[PDB]
Design a protein around this ligand. Structure first.
Ligand SMILES: Cc1nn(-c2ccccn2)c2sc(NC(=O)c3ccccc3)cc12
Ligand SMILES: [Mg+2]
Ligand SMILES: [Zn+2]
Length: 313
């Protein structure tokens, strides 16, 4: 079992960095991901043929939408890989295995519509799960793919460890529901500052992994400016599509989702960086100091959106 995936020189160096961009070649993302699982985990932890059949089925079940697509899945996994590599000692053999699978599967079968739109459209999935509607759906789909033949990449685990790792993945994926983020971060801030944040508490680990999942999901805000700028077009194109479907139901959508209100994009990004992104990576850096590069890049992009409002670009 001496088959070590290697990346060309620039990628091999650049991939270790939080701000790495996985590039425009779809055909290299599976190799990128496997390279990350091997360095991150062990060459031992998964059987290559099962892994490769698991990854390809996950790709086939991501859809052709402007932002919540197979590129995004691999990007989020990459940022999780970077967090783990810079915090080597804090995570168990199970967490490292589970979390990179979580990140790849976190937006499985996403059609480009918020939980909110499912509720007002009255989509069946919203009948089955009242809160975190898409996030329970994503997990449901992960589990479906796990139970295909030749796809049980966790087959070498006891009954116990298997249940722990699937409960890591479930909590991980639920935590990508941003409505949950606000409370999760309020509570972590209050634990860190009253000195009670304790990582042996399974209750406290769950919340901290929940924060990493938010950090990894937002991580287009932590890239270099030209990648941040260009991903914004993809993000807004999903939002505008949904506002279009909102209007189709007889509902004026919020200005974020109204494509007649493009003028207000950079101001909307300010709001988001101030109200979400900066607080997210602020709190995460207090809990996990080696993630500071995420806060630095996030402030830089906040500063680059201020320059777009002031006419200097
Ligand atoms: C204005 C804007 N930019 N932007 C963005 C920028 C970079 C990367 C990802 N997202 C977001 S995400 C968001 N709000 C939610 O997704 C949401 C979901 C459920 C409940 C409440 C809010 C708003 C917003
Ligand atoms: Mg999602
Ligand atoms: Zn996502």
């Amino acid at each position: 079992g001496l088959m070590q995936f290697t990346l060309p020189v620039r990628l091999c160096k650049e991939i270790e960095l939080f701000h790495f961009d996985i590039g425009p070649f779809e055909n290299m993302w599976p190799g990128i991901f496997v390279y990350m699982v091997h360095r991150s985990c062990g060459t031992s932890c998964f059987e290559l043929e099962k892994l490769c059949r698991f990854i390809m089925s996950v790709k086939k079940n991501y859809r052709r939408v402007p932002y919540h697509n197979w590129k995004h899945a691999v990007t989020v996994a990459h940022c999780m890989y970077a967090i783990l590599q810079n915090n080597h000692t804090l995570f168990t053999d199970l967490e490292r295995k589970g979390l990179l699978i979580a990140c790849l599967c976190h937006d499985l079968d996403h059609r480009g519509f918020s939980n909110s739109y499912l509720q007002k459209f009255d989509h069946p999935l919203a009948a089955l799960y009242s809160t975190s509607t898409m996030e329970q759906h994503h997990f449901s789909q992960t589990v479906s793919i796990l139970q295909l033949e030749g796809h049980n990449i966790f087959s070498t685990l006891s009954s116990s460890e298997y249940e722990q790792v699937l409960e890591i993945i479930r909590k991980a994926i639920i935590a990508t529901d941003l409505a949950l983020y606000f409370g999760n971060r309020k509570q972590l801030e209050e634990m860190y500052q009253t000195g009670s944040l304790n990582l042996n508490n399974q209750s406290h680990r769950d919340r901290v992994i929940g924060l990493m999942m938010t950090a990894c999901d937002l991580c287009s805000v932590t890239k270099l400016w030209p990648v941040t700028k260009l991903t914004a077009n993809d993000i807004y194109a999903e939002f505008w599509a949904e506002g279009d479907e909102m209007k189709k139901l007889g509902i004026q959508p919020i200005p974020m989702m109204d494509r007649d209100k493009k003028d207000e994009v950079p101001q909307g990004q300010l709001g988001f960086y101030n109200a979400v992104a900066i607080p997210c990576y602020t709190t995460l850096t207090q809990i996990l100091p080696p993630t500071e590069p995420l806060l630095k890049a996030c402030r830089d992009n906040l500063s680059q959106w201020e320059k777009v409002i002031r006419g200097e670009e």
